[PDB]
Short mmCIF file of all heavy atoms in Angstrom, two decimals:
data_model
loop_
_atom_site.label_atom_id
_atom_site.label_comp_id
_atom_site.label_asym_id
_atom_site.label_seq_id
_atom_site.Cartn_x
_atom_site.Cartn_y
_atom_site.Cartn_z
N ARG G 97 -24.71 -35.08 46.81
CA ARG G 97 -24.62 -36.29 47.61
C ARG G 97 -25.54 -37.36 47.05
O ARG G 97 -25.09 -38.34 46.46
CB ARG G 97 -24.96 -36.01 49.08
CG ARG G 97 -25.50 -37.22 49.82
CD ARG G 97 -25.05 -37.22 51.27
NE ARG G 97 -23.63 -36.91 51.38
CZ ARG G 97 -23.14 -35.85 52.01
NH1 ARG G 97 -23.97 -35.01 52.62
NH2 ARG G 97 -21.83 -35.64 52.07
N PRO G 139 -21.55 -30.86 49.63
CA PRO G 139 -22.24 -31.67 48.62
C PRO G 139 -23.76 -31.53 48.71
O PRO G 139 -24.46 -31.73 47.73
CB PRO G 139 -21.80 -33.09 48.97
CG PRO G 139 -20.41 -32.91 49.54
CD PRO G 139 -20.34 -31.52 50.14
N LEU G 174 -17.14 -29.47 59.48
CA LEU G 174 -15.91 -28.79 59.10
C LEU G 174 -15.08 -29.50 58.04
O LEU G 174 -14.01 -29.02 57.68
CB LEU G 174 -15.06 -28.54 60.35
CG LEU G 174 -15.70 -27.65 61.41
CD1 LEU G 174 -14.78 -27.53 62.62
CD2 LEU G 174 -16.01 -26.27 60.83
N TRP G 175 -15.57 -30.63 57.53
CA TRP G 175 -14.81 -31.44 56.59
C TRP G 175 -14.38 -30.63 55.37
O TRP G 175 -13.48 -31.04 54.63
CB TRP G 175 -15.61 -32.67 56.15
CG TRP G 175 -16.15 -33.50 57.29
CD1 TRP G 175 -15.67 -33.55 58.57
CD2 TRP G 175 -17.27 -34.40 57.25
NE1 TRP G 175 -16.43 -34.42 59.33
CE2 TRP G 175 -17.42 -34.94 58.54
CE3 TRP G 175 -18.16 -34.79 56.24
CZ2 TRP G 175 -18.41 -35.87 58.85
CZ3 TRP G 175 -19.15 -35.70 56.55
CH2 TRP G 175 -19.27 -36.23 57.84
N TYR G 176 -14.99 -29.46 55.18
CA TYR G 176 -14.70 -28.64 54.00
C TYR G 176 -14.09 -27.27 54.29
O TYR G 176 -13.48 -26.67 53.41
CB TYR G 176 -15.94 -28.51 53.12
CG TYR G 176 -16.62 -29.83 52.84
CD1 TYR G 176 -17.74 -30.22 53.56
CD2 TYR G 176 -16.12 -30.69 51.87
CE1 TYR G 176 -18.36 -31.44 53.31
CE2 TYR G 176 -16.74 -31.91 51.61
CZ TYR G 176 -17.85 -32.28 52.34
OH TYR G 176 -18.47 -33.48 52.09
N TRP G 194 -10.65 -23.99 48.47
CA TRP G 194 -10.24 -25.10 49.32
C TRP G 194 -11.37 -26.12 49.46
O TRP G 194 -11.13 -27.33 49.37
CB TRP G 194 -9.82 -24.60 50.70
CG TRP G 194 -9.40 -25.71 51.62
CD1 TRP G 194 -10.20 -26.44 52.45
CD2 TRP G 194 -8.08 -26.25 51.76
NE1 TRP G 194 -9.45 -27.38 53.12
CE2 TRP G 194 -8.15 -27.29 52.71
CE3 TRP G 194 -6.84 -25.96 51.17
CZ2 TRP G 194 -7.03 -28.04 53.09
CZ3 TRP G 194 -5.73 -26.69 51.56
CH2 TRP G 194 -5.83 -27.71 52.51
N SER G 195 -12.58 -25.63 49.68
CA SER G 195 -13.76 -26.49 49.71
C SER G 195 -13.95 -27.21 48.37
O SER G 195 -14.52 -28.30 48.33
CB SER G 195 -15.01 -25.68 50.06
OG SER G 195 -14.87 -25.02 51.30
N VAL G 196 -13.48 -26.59 47.29
CA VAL G 196 -13.63 -27.17 45.96
C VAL G 196 -12.68 -28.32 45.70
O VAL G 196 -12.99 -29.24 44.94
CB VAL G 196 -13.50 -26.10 44.86
CG1 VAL G 196 -13.47 -26.77 43.49
CG2 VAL G 196 -14.64 -25.10 44.94
N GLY G 197 -11.49 -28.25 46.29
CA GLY G 197 -10.53 -29.34 46.22
C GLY G 197 -11.04 -30.58 46.94
O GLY G 197 -11.08 -31.67 46.37
N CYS G 198 -11.43 -30.39 48.20
CA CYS G 198 -12.01 -31.46 49.01
C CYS G 198 -13.08 -32.19 48.23
O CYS G 198 -13.14 -33.43 48.24
CB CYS G 198 -12.63 -30.88 50.28
SG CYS G 198 -11.43 -30.14 51.42
N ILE G 199 -13.93 -31.43 47.56
CA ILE G 199 -15.04 -31.97 46.77
C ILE G 199 -14.51 -32.67 45.53
O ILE G 199 -15.02 -33.70 45.11
CB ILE G 199 -16.05 -30.87 46.41
CG1 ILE G 199 -16.83 -30.43 47.65
CG2 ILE G 199 -17.01 -31.37 45.34
CD1 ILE G 199 -17.91 -31.41 48.06
N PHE G 200 -13.48 -32.08 44.92
CA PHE G 200 -12.81 -32.69 43.78
C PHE G 200 -12.41 -34.11 44.15
O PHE G 200 -12.85 -35.08 43.53
CB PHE G 200 -11.58 -31.86 43.42
CG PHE G 200 -10.87 -32.34 42.18
CD1 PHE G 200 -11.50 -33.17 41.28
CD2 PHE G 200 -9.56 -31.94 41.93
CE1 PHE G 200 -10.85 -33.60 40.14
CE2 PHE G 200 -8.90 -32.37 40.79
CZ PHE G 200 -9.54 -33.20 39.90
N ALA G 201 -11.65 -34.23 45.24
CA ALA G 201 -11.16 -35.53 45.71
C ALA G 201 -12.27 -36.48 46.15
O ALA G 201 -12.34 -37.62 45.68
CB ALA G 201 -10.15 -35.33 46.82
N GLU G 202 -13.11 -36.04 47.08
CA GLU G 202 -14.22 -36.86 47.55
C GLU G 202 -15.04 -37.45 46.41
O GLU G 202 -15.81 -38.40 46.61
CB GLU G 202 -15.12 -36.05 48.48
CG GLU G 202 -16.47 -36.68 48.72
CD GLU G 202 -17.25 -35.98 49.80
OE1 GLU G 202 -16.73 -35.00 50.37
OE2 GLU G 202 -18.39 -36.41 50.08
N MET G 203 -14.89 -36.88 45.22
CA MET G 203 -15.65 -37.34 44.06
C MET G 203 -15.28 -38.75 43.64
O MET G 203 -16.16 -39.59 43.45
CB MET G 203 -15.51 -36.36 42.89
CG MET G 203 -16.38 -35.12 43.04
SD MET G 203 -16.16 -33.89 41.72
CE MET G 203 -17.22 -34.53 40.46
N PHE G 204 -13.98 -39.01 43.48
CA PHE G 204 -13.51 -40.38 43.27
C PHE G 204 -12.91 -41.10 44.47
O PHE G 204 -11.95 -41.87 44.34
CB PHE G 204 -12.67 -40.57 41.99
CG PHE G 204 -12.00 -39.33 41.50
CD1 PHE G 204 -11.58 -38.34 42.37
CD2 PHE G 204 -11.74 -39.18 40.15
CE1 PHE G 204 -10.96 -37.19 41.89
CE2 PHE G 204 -11.10 -38.05 39.66
CZ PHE G 204 -10.73 -37.05 40.53
N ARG G 205 -13.42 -40.77 45.64
CA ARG G 205 -13.48 -41.70 46.75
C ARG G 205 -14.95 -42.08 46.78
O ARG G 205 -15.59 -42.22 45.74
CB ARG G 205 -13.19 -40.98 48.07
CG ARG G 205 -11.75 -40.57 48.27
CD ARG G 205 -11.66 -39.52 49.36
NE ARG G 205 -10.60 -39.82 50.30
CZ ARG G 205 -10.80 -40.34 51.51
NH1 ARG G 205 -12.04 -40.60 51.93
NH2 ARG G 205 -9.76 -40.59 52.30
N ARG G 206 -15.47 -42.20 47.99
CA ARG G 206 -16.87 -41.91 48.22
C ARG G 206 -17.16 -41.64 49.68
O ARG G 206 -17.75 -42.46 50.37
CB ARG G 206 -17.82 -42.93 47.60
CG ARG G 206 -18.32 -42.51 46.23
CD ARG G 206 -19.67 -43.12 45.91
NE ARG G 206 -19.59 -44.57 45.77
CZ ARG G 206 -20.62 -45.36 45.51
NH1 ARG G 206 -21.84 -44.84 45.37
NH2 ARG G 206 -20.45 -46.67 45.40
N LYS G 207 -16.50 -40.59 50.16
CA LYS G 207 -16.90 -39.82 51.34
C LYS G 207 -15.75 -38.91 51.76
O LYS G 207 -14.64 -39.02 51.21
CB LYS G 207 -17.39 -40.71 52.49
CG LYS G 207 -18.89 -41.02 52.41
CD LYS G 207 -19.32 -42.07 53.43
CE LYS G 207 -19.93 -41.43 54.66
NZ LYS G 207 -19.05 -40.40 55.27
N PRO G 208 -16.02 -37.93 52.63
CA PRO G 208 -15.12 -36.87 53.08
C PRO G 208 -13.64 -37.25 53.06
O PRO G 208 -13.22 -38.21 53.71
CB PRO G 208 -15.59 -36.61 54.51
CG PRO G 208 -17.06 -37.00 54.51
CD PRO G 208 -17.33 -37.85 53.29
N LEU G 209 -12.86 -36.49 52.30
CA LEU G 209 -11.41 -36.65 52.28
C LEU G 209 -10.80 -36.23 53.61
O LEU G 209 -9.74 -36.72 54.01
CB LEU G 209 -10.81 -35.83 51.13
CG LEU G 209 -9.30 -35.93 50.89
CD1 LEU G 209 -8.94 -35.34 49.54
CD2 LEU G 209 -8.53 -35.21 51.99
N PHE G 210 -11.48 -35.32 54.31
CA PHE G 210 -10.98 -34.75 55.56
C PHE G 210 -12.08 -34.80 56.62
O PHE G 210 -12.56 -33.76 57.07
CB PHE G 210 -10.57 -33.29 55.35
CG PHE G 210 -9.21 -33.11 54.74
CD1 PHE G 210 -9.02 -32.22 53.69
CD2 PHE G 210 -8.12 -33.81 55.23
CE1 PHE G 210 -7.76 -32.05 53.14
CE2 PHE G 210 -6.87 -33.65 54.68
CZ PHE G 210 -6.69 -32.76 53.63
N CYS G 211 -12.45 -36.00 57.05
CA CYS G 211 -13.64 -36.19 57.86
C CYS G 211 -13.35 -36.07 59.36
O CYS G 211 -13.33 -37.08 60.07
CB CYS G 211 -14.25 -37.56 57.55
SG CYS G 211 -16.05 -37.67 57.64
N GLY G 212 -13.19 -34.85 59.85
CA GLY G 212 -12.78 -34.59 61.23
C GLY G 212 -13.88 -34.12 62.17
O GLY G 212 -15.03 -34.53 62.05
N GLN G 218 -9.69 -31.20 62.55
CA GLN G 218 -9.72 -30.99 61.11
C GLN G 218 -8.35 -30.56 60.59
O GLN G 218 -7.95 -30.93 59.48
CB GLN G 218 -10.77 -29.94 60.76
CG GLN G 218 -10.95 -29.72 59.27
CD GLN G 218 -11.80 -30.80 58.62
OE1 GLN G 218 -11.49 -31.26 57.52
NE2 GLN G 218 -12.88 -31.18 59.28
N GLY G 220 -4.83 -31.03 61.85
CA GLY G 220 -3.85 -32.10 61.77
C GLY G 220 -4.27 -33.13 60.74
O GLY G 220 -3.45 -33.65 59.99
N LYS G 221 -5.57 -33.39 60.69
CA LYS G 221 -6.17 -34.26 59.69
C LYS G 221 -5.81 -33.76 58.29
O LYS G 221 -5.57 -34.55 57.37
CB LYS G 221 -7.69 -34.28 59.87
CG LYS G 221 -8.29 -35.66 59.93
CD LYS G 221 -9.45 -35.70 60.90
CE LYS G 221 -9.87 -37.12 61.22
NZ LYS G 221 -10.80 -37.17 62.38
N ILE G 222 -5.74 -32.44 58.15
CA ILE G 222 -5.33 -31.81 56.90
C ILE G 222 -3.81 -31.88 56.73
O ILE G 222 -3.31 -32.28 55.68
CB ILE G 222 -5.83 -30.35 56.81
CG1 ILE G 222 -7.33 -30.32 56.53
CG2 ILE G 222 -5.06 -29.58 55.75
CD1 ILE G 222 -7.95 -28.96 56.69
N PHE G 223 -3.08 -31.51 57.78
CA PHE G 223 -1.62 -31.54 57.75
C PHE G 223 -1.10 -32.94 57.47
O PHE G 223 -0.03 -33.11 56.89
CB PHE G 223 -1.04 -31.00 59.06
CG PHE G 223 -1.34 -29.55 59.29
CD1 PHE G 223 -2.38 -29.16 60.11
CD2 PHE G 223 -0.59 -28.57 58.66
CE1 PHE G 223 -2.67 -27.82 60.31
CE2 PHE G 223 -0.87 -27.23 58.86
CZ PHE G 223 -1.91 -26.86 59.69
N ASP G 224 -1.87 -33.94 57.89
CA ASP G 224 -1.56 -35.33 57.55
C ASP G 224 -1.37 -35.44 56.05
O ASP G 224 -0.39 -36.02 55.57
CB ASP G 224 -2.71 -36.25 57.99
CG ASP G 224 -2.86 -36.34 59.50
OD1 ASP G 224 -2.10 -35.66 60.22
OD2 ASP G 224 -3.73 -37.10 59.96
N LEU G 225 -2.28 -34.83 55.30
CA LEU G 225 -2.30 -34.95 53.85
C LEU G 225 -1.34 -33.96 53.20
O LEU G 225 -0.41 -34.35 52.51
CB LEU G 225 -3.73 -34.73 53.33
CG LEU G 225 -4.07 -35.30 51.96
CD1 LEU G 225 -5.43 -34.80 51.50
CD2 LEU G 225 -3.00 -34.97 50.93
N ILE G 226 -1.57 -32.67 53.45
CA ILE G 226 -0.80 -31.61 52.81
C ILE G 226 0.56 -31.40 53.46
O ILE G 226 1.44 -30.74 52.89
CB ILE G 226 -1.60 -30.29 52.76
CG1 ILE G 226 -0.97 -29.31 51.77
CG2 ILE G 226 -1.69 -29.67 54.14
CD1 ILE G 226 -0.96 -29.80 50.33
N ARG G 247 2.71 -35.83 52.31
CA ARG G 247 2.32 -37.12 51.75
C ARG G 247 2.05 -36.93 50.26
O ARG G 247 1.57 -35.87 49.83
CB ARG G 247 1.06 -37.64 52.43
CG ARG G 247 1.25 -37.93 53.91
CD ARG G 247 0.01 -38.56 54.54
NE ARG G 247 0.25 -38.82 55.95
CZ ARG G 247 -0.68 -39.22 56.82
NH1 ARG G 247 -1.93 -39.40 56.41
NH2 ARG G 247 -0.35 -39.43 58.08
N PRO G 248 2.42 -37.92 49.44
CA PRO G 248 2.04 -37.84 48.04
C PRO G 248 0.53 -37.69 47.97
O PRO G 248 -0.17 -38.04 48.92
CB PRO G 248 2.42 -39.21 47.48
CG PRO G 248 3.40 -39.76 48.44
CD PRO G 248 3.04 -39.21 49.77
N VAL G 249 0.03 -37.41 46.78
CA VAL G 249 -1.39 -37.59 46.54
C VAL G 249 -1.69 -39.06 46.81
O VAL G 249 -0.80 -39.82 47.20
CB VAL G 249 -1.74 -37.21 45.10
CG1 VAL G 249 -3.22 -36.86 44.98
CG2 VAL G 249 -0.86 -36.06 44.62
N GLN G 250 -2.91 -39.46 46.49
CA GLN G 250 -3.21 -40.85 46.19
C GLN G 250 -2.59 -41.90 47.12
O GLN G 250 -1.98 -42.86 46.66
CB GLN G 250 -2.80 -41.18 44.76
CG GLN G 250 -1.73 -40.26 44.17
CD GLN G 250 -0.59 -41.06 43.63
OE1 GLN G 250 -0.13 -40.85 42.50
NE2 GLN G 250 -0.17 -42.05 44.39
N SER G 251 -2.63 -41.63 48.42
CA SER G 251 -2.76 -42.70 49.41
C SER G 251 -4.11 -42.36 50.04
O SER G 251 -4.48 -42.89 51.08
CB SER G 251 -1.64 -42.64 50.45
OG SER G 251 -2.14 -42.34 51.74
N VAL G 252 -4.76 -41.36 49.44
CA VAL G 252 -6.18 -41.06 49.61
C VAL G 252 -6.84 -41.03 48.23
O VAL G 252 -8.05 -40.87 48.12
CB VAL G 252 -6.40 -39.74 50.39
CG1 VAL G 252 -7.88 -39.38 50.47
CG2 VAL G 252 -5.80 -39.84 51.78
N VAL G 253 -6.02 -41.08 47.17
CA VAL G 253 -6.49 -41.52 45.86
C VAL G 253 -5.62 -42.70 45.38
O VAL G 253 -4.84 -43.24 46.16
CB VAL G 253 -6.54 -40.38 44.82
CG1 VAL G 253 -6.57 -39.03 45.50
CG2 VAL G 253 -5.40 -40.46 43.83
N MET G 256 -7.47 -40.95 40.81
CA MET G 256 -6.90 -39.76 40.14
C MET G 256 -5.66 -39.93 39.26
O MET G 256 -4.74 -40.67 39.60
CB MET G 256 -6.73 -38.61 41.12
CG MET G 256 -8.02 -37.84 41.36
SD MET G 256 -7.79 -36.40 42.42
CE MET G 256 -6.15 -35.96 41.99
N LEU G 264 -5.53 -30.74 42.29
CA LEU G 264 -6.10 -30.89 43.62
C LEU G 264 -5.16 -30.34 44.70
O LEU G 264 -5.60 -29.94 45.77
CB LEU G 264 -6.41 -32.36 43.90
CG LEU G 264 -7.14 -32.66 45.21
CD1 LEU G 264 -8.36 -31.76 45.34
CD2 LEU G 264 -7.55 -34.12 45.25
N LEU G 265 -3.86 -30.34 44.40
CA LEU G 265 -2.87 -29.76 45.30
C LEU G 265 -2.95 -28.24 45.30
O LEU G 265 -3.01 -27.62 46.37
CB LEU G 265 -1.46 -30.22 44.92
CG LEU G 265 -1.03 -31.58 45.48
CD1 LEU G 265 0.44 -31.85 45.18
CD2 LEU G 265 -1.30 -31.66 46.98
N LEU G 268 -5.64 -27.39 47.26
CA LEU G 268 -5.35 -27.63 48.67
C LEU G 268 -3.98 -27.10 49.09
O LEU G 268 -3.17 -27.82 49.67
CB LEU G 268 -5.52 -29.11 49.04
CG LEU G 268 -6.93 -29.65 48.79
CD1 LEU G 268 -7.21 -30.89 49.63
CD2 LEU G 268 -7.98 -28.58 49.05
#
Side-chain angles (χ1 to χ4, degrees):
Chain G
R97 154 146 314 118
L174 299 177
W175 307 337
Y176 311 99
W194 179 271
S195 302
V196 172
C198 295
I199 289 283
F200 184 18
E202 164 171 359
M203 282 176 83
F204 25 31
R205 288 163 133 257
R206 265 207 294 179
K207 272 171 99 307
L209 183 166
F210 279 134
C211 213
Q218 184 79 222
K221 230 144 193 168
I222 286 169
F223 295 98
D224 293 2
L225 202 189
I226 195 63
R247 296 185 180 172
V249 203
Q250 23 127 131
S251 115
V252 176
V253 340
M256 279 184 31
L264 186 50
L265 277 187
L268 301 202

